[PDB]
Amino acid sequence: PVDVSVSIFINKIYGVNTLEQTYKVDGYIVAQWTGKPRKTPGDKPLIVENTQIERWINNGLWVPALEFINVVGSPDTGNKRLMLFPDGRVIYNARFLGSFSNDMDFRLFPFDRQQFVLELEPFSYNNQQLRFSDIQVYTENIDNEEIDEWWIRGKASTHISDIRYDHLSSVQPNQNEFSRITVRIDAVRNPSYYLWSFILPLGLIIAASWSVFWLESFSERLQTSFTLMLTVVAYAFYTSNILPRLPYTTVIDQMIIAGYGSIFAAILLIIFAHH
Amino acid sequence: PVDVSVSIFINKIYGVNTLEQTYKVDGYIVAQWTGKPRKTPGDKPLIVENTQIERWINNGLWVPALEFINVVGSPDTGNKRLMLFPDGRVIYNARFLGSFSNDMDFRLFPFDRQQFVLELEPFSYNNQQLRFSDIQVYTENIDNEEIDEWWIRGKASTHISDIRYDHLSSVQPNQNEFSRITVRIDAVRNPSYYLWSFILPLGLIIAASWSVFWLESFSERLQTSFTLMLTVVAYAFYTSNILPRLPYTTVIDQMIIAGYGSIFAAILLIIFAHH
Amino acid sequence: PVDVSVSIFINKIYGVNTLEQTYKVDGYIVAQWTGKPRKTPGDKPLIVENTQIERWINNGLWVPALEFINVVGSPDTGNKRLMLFPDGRVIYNARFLGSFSNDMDFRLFPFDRQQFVLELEPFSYNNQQLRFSDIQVYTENIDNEEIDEWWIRGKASTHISDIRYDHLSSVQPNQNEFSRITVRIDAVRNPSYYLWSFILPLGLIIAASWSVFWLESFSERLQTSFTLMLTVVAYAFYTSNILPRLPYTTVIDQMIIAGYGSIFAAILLIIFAHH
Amino acid sequence: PVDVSVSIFINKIYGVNTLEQTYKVDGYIVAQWTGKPRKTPGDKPLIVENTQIERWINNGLWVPALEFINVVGSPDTGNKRLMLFPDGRVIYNARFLGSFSNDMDFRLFPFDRQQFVLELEPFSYNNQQLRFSDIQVYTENIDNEEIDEWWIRGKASTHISDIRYDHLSSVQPNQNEFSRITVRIDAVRNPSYYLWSFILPLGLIIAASWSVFWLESFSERLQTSFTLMLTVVAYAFYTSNILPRLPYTTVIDQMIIAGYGSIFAAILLIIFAHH
Amino acid sequence: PVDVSVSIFINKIYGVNTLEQTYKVDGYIVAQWTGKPRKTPGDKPLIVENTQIERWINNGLWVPALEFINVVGSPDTGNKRLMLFPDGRVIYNARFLGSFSNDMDFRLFPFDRQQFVLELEPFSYNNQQLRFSDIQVYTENIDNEEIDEWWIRGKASTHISDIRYDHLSSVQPNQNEFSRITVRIDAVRNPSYYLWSFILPLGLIIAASWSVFWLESFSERLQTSFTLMLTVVAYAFYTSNILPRLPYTTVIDQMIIAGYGSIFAAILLIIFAHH
């Protein structure tokens, strides 16, 4: 098996659209791996640019199509280049960009932390021909930076594993195991925006519910508490477009339903006392 | 007729946009089928990658264009590879991705269950040359997993049928029958989010309608009930973007119109009692 | 002139986005037309798939580029195939998909009916070389089906006309007439959703205006009628995104402005009676 | 310099999205220009379709890439054809479609009129080789028609000018002048929709402000005027998505701020009279 | 190293979508650089258009792929041309368009000023072969113009720096330094729209809070102040879609939370005085 020494450069991480569960990562991929030595023009290494390596592939050169697994859509590769050292090593430097997906739970919506993953796997070849030797993620551009609401703390952890696919077992009997790469970028939500803008005014609405508890006119209590329902109905509209369609409850919608429950408790209390 | 032994690997199912009736499925397609034996380089099987099989097709090799029927748009195939075993078998492994469509009724919107289908059919050849032998959907990645609000329960059922198209009958008199593949993935809506977030506060609004029934000031009853109309008007706005444009009624809009009817019943009752 | 016997298969009609005046139609196009006989391999007809007919076109084969006229954007053709019968007939079966546009008036918005048209025309050739012989729209998939709010009643009517373009008259003196195809699919809005969800609650708001006519406290009448303005302002917001930017009035915005006029009539009446 | 006799056919004008300053125009471009005579097959003119003229370009044929200047994005050309008359003239008929941009002021938002421009310019060649002879816009399809809210009155005016670019002066010393085409389609907003739907209910809100001026209970005056603020806050939400992000004021937001000023004048008057 | 004399023409700057941190810039790129002299047809310079320079690249011609760094997505190049002067100079004129990204803080949201940057860098070659000699941004089209809310004041500043990438150090030991270009266009938000439309009505709401401070009925004070909460809840909905998801506070959301704090101060004051 021909070992590949991959190394991923992360340039920017942006557009974490949690509504439909994706995030875009932009950067560079480097795939150094050894091969048969050849005679290049001069002692200088040979550089072949985009839309010219296809001639080399048709001429008989091998280059692996390192696809991504957790990507949605086609990863739109920009410029891509292919080193050809005379003594044997080949470097496949390409600029990758795609929308990547994680499971990415939201148990605590403002106090939130997940992992950004780039699950890389050879599409065509299995562990018998291509096995990934090592990976070093040189992510010095975003290693300690403040991007969007996602603070990237710590270095990017890496994994090299042998993942066996069973859907190729019917067509490949014993050679269907793949050398998979999984990097993990630890990212934490910055909760300053939500704490400043969404949570405290909900506390003010709950304080207004305490005020209508303190109110001293029963029909006017009912009128004010219906205005409270109008106030909480004013929520979860510019709020529903920031949390995803999610089966369990966050703390934000828990605060919304707690305000609804307190308001309804106030009205059921005053009606049951009136009757 | 040359038999094809297809096998579909389902990787991820995501983005079930019920508003305009689509869902995206991502995965791998494997099409094993026998052919004329050839002399490959060495005893090793021959691997041809993306944008290189076109040379083989121009050289005279046959490969079927297995299209999808329930797909909208072009299915953006990523990397695709073509085995060439020396003794005759050919494997066409490709990574497919497209937006697929089902009829997908919504008679019970939160308590909802449908089938995700991938209706596969040979585009160019009929039952006389290409007949699908068998399919085994090795969907072990999503067989029992919790994705979005869609819990995938049970294994993926399969069907092989002979579907006759009549629009080719005028140009092909007796040979216009197609061997069609229909897989069925049983999927159920998780109703936890809607039960927690939409249905119970509507019950609180109906309880507030009971409270304004209990109210003891006629002009103030009218004022509060108009605030109730404002409250129900606050619904079906962040709610109308989660159910599709659909001719009959769900239970959610049935609850909305029941709240409207109860509110109007309260007002017509108090006005008819006043007169 | 070489006659072409076209026949369009309609698969699905979806996504009638009336806001910016488009609708998507998906289906198959068949273009049977006779030509010079050739020697095909064997007595079997020759099948050439996608991205292989270009070699035949470069080799000297003629195939017409049947474009659409009422399409917006490029119609994204998927797989496309080209029969070659030995005795002379050629069949050009392709899968077309595009967003199509009609004038599509909305004089009665819920009680609405229009025609879906697919205006087909040869792009390159005029009536002297290519004249469309006949069309039979075999639309059995959507002939009597319930899609979205659009019930497709009746069969699809067809037209063959000779449309003369004047912009080619300066460059082609006497040969600038085109054999145009216009099919017409009669489609009717299903008014159940609007009658159930939008029109009747507006009647309830008008009944509340009758109630504030019945009210017996002048300052409280003014307060309630301003709450009525708040109620009608709550409309035409989730309503304005369902009707297009349209110069005249529908019946929905007529109901909105009638509610506004009744509310303002109530307030001007009570103010003029107060003064 | 080789003269080009261009003539643009306008098919449809649609999608004038004033929010981010664009409009789409669809139609046909015809570029007749003389060249070296050649021997075509027979006396019949030669027709070459899409994705086949590239062979002629590689064979040595000249064809200008007539780009657009005020276009945003790439103009997605559909089918395109190239005449080859034997005696010398060449006609380049193509179907262009793109999103075009004008400065397009909005000083009077409902009583609005602008010019739709299609600024055409040769990308590669300057005035020394390619000079546009004349243009006649045969826009008979939209010359007098009612599209969206834009009534197209009058014929489309044309301009031929020599525009000098200075960014090519450092690399081309004396030959950097371009023969530019600017057509102008005079378009006027139809103000019926805004006059019927937005302006008159604002007058009703101002009349309600007159009514709260007429009101006879000071605390109830304050309550009603705060409901007036709620009413005007209900505006500029479904209104802010119809006018662009624009530095000066239209008449619509002038009416909004005039309502705000009248409401605040009423409250400051009653508070200053109370004190 | 072969020096390159680049010069960027800026045509339009539009679509500064601050919500997800991007801005589009449209214009022309000119890359003049010397090379080996060749025999061109005649003394006239040779012009090669789009989709024809690939033949020259395959024939052995060198042309650099000048990529952008701060671009998101692929920059969709339109028409592109390549001069070939006989004595040696080569000019690579291309029309670039892409969405570019800056850090772009928003510490003062209406009183806002940032820099638009176009960070240009050779993708394939390092400082040993390609070093950028000089840049002159001939931006006379937008140098002093009023675009959107962004007034472009001053000329576009330029920078030429040697930026060393460390992710290529493992594969290139001593030759991994890149000659990077960074232009800076100084742009200032026009604050007229926000001052006219958002800030002053917030001052009117604060004045209404002063009015409810002046109010003389405690239950009616509570009712009015809850209507004030409804008024401020009416904000930050058509306001939240104009400022990005941002961790710290602007002055607009500071005004929103100051209104919330003043309203809650009023209610806590009247409740504590009542108790």
Residue numbers in the entry:
A (entry chain C), B (entry chain D), C (entry chain E), D (entry chain A), E (entry chain B): 11 to 285
Publication passage describing the model:
Here, we report cryo-EM structures of ELIC in liposomes where the ion channel is confirmed to be in resting, activated, and desensitized states. The structures of ELIC in liposomes have the same overall architecture as structures of ELIC or other pLGICs in nanodiscs, consisting of a homopentameric assembly around a central ion conduction pore. Each subunit consists of an ECD and TMD. Proteoliposomes were formed using a 2:1:1 molar ratio of POPC (1-palmitoyl-2-oleoyl-phosphatidylcholine):POPE (1-palmitoyl-2-oleoyl-phosphatidylethanolamine):POPG (1-palmitoyl-2-oleoyl-phosphatidylglycerol); these lipids are known to support ELIC activity, and phosphatidylethanolamine and phosphatidylglycerol are the two principal phospholipids found in gram-negative bacteria in which ELIC is expressed.
To test this possibility, we reconstituted WT ELIC in spNW25, a circularized nanodisc with an average diameter of 25 nm, for single particle cryo-EM analysis, and determined a structure of ELIC in the presence of agonist (propylamine). spNW25 nanodiscs are significantly larger than the 11 nm (spMSP1D1) and 15 nm (spNW15) nanodiscs previously used for agonist-bound WT ELIC structures. Initial inspection of the micrographs showed multiple ELIC particles in most nanodiscs and localization of the particles to the rim of the nanodisc. Consistent with this observation, side views of the 2D class averages and the resulting 3D reconstruction using C1 symmetry showed significant MSP density on one side of the TMD. A C5 reconstruction of agonist-bound WT ELIC in spNW25 also did not show densities for M4. Unexpectedly, the structure in the largest nanodisc, spNW25, deviates most from the liposome structure. In the spNW25 structure, there is a shortening of M1 and M2 and tilting of M3 toward the membrane that decreases the height of these transmembrane helices along the pore axis by ~1–1.5 Å compared to the liposome and spMSP1D1 structures. Along with this, M2 is tilted toward the pore axis, narrowing the pore even further at L240 (9’) and Q233 (2’). Contrary to what was previously suggested, the agonist-bound WT ELIC structure in a large nanodisc (spNW25) deviates most from the structure in liposomes, indicating that such large nanodiscs do not recapitulate the membrane environment of a liposome. Strikingly, ELIC localizes only to the rim of this large nanodisc.
